[model samples]
Target: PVIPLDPARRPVIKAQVDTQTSHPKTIEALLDTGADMTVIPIALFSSNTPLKNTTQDHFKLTSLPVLIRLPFRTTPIVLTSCLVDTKNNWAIIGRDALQQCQGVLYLP
Candidate 1:
């Protein structure tokens, strides 16, 4: 299961996720360096009304089958790409996502 990061975890590295297709579903993605890009929630993408006039072909884009290799952890986590049309949404912070940022990870 994917866990949503808290707002206190602000200053998240942001980026754009583009699906490989004629018309791609590109959304503002948060650079979750912590997560290996393996847990995009469903609310992010829905075909109800196409957010960017593009269709998502998970298979076409850089489809990651398992968790990306990291310095820690023995097993890899799975991931899925998605779109978002919800109100006031568009923030992600995974392990891989956070690593892409410019700072270090520390807990208070």
Candidate 2:
């Protein structure tokens, strides 16, 4: 199945970021073909997870399996080990997460 593109020719979808607590975060994420890894906010994880120093420029958090629901998909897909962005307020859907879904995007 293929998902539709936005007016700006970009694929934007809503996703649920499963926080460790009962309060999960739902936000809009842009499908980024340029990003090598899916980037999420560090605030989504449990504080005791011992995330690496955010000032390092680049680092991978422990592979946290998260279930995300795409607008076109009926079920949630499990994505793993998304990069932790200490200051980012939005999520960037990368190839890693897209590959897991294995869905195509139909742009008009």
Candidate 3:
């Protein structure tokens, strides 16, 4: 049976910026399964050059993680390389990416 996969469901969180040559910038992002969670686009991770960041300055203001309460437990999801389109920069939330919600997917 397939699990209830919702592209509409996502978590709002901050990403830890890691770079060797430049300072890392903590960027706010929506944990979207529609997007590969592993590799963030280079445009979003550009360094020093604030031209892109300036695109949406006031739009982003660092918000806390949104807390969601389920009737049971967190789902069991995993993350791994797609092999086909797996790049170091592009990340996607895979099948095992997020917890399974302890049987959240109901087949009706």
Candidate 4:
């Protein structure tokens, strides 16, 4: 399935993120090669989410991997501690996660 683009026309992909709930929710994530690490909103880590807050700005999420279904392979991308950008309000698939999945990003 082709994930729809945002108003800004950035590339977006759909992934199932294991949340605190029993079932995973398909989220819209942007492909961001400029970012070093993946970034997600802190709201997704609420409820039963396994996220540990170290400092006011730093956090760690455990076990919950993102399942992305690409054309060739369906894989889970394990991300390290993601930067909590509550203001951003969008999940970003950064270079770190891209390398793990052997992904190449194209911008038009």
lDDT of each: 0.37, 0.68, 0.32, 0.62
Q: Candidate 3 vs candidate 4: which has greater TM-score? A: 4
Mind giving the per-residue lDDT tens digits that candidate 4 earns over 1-108?
A: 344547679887776665443455667887887888676655565665555554465544444544434444566666645655555566777887778876674467
lDDT of 1 by residue, 1-108 (tens): 233458776543333332222232333445455544334333334344333322243312223222222233334323354333233454454554344333355555
> For residue 47, what is the lDDT in candidate 3?
45
RMSD of every candidate to native, in Å, equals 10.6, 3.5, 11.9, 4.5
Candidate 4 stretches with Cα past 4 Å from truth are: 1-8, 19-23, 48-72, 105-108
Residue 59 lDDT (model 3) = 24
Best by TM-score: 2
- Model 2: residues >4 Å from true position, as ranges? 1-10, 19-22, 52-55, 58-60, 105-108
TM-score ranking of the models:
2, 4, 1, 3
TM-score of each: 0.30, 0.69, 0.29, 0.62
Better of 2 and 3 by lDDT: 2
State the displacement of the C-alpha of residue 90, model 1, in Å, after optimal TM-score superposition.
4.6
Ranked by lDDT, top first: 2, 4, 1, 3
- Across 1-108, the per-residue lDDT of candidate 2 in tens digits comes to 445655767677788876453367777887877787787776677766765443476544545566677666768766655677766555888888888787455455
Select the stronger candidate by lDDT from 1 and 2: 2
| Two-way TM-score contest, 1 vs 2, winner | 2
Worst 10 residues of 3 by lDDT: 59-68
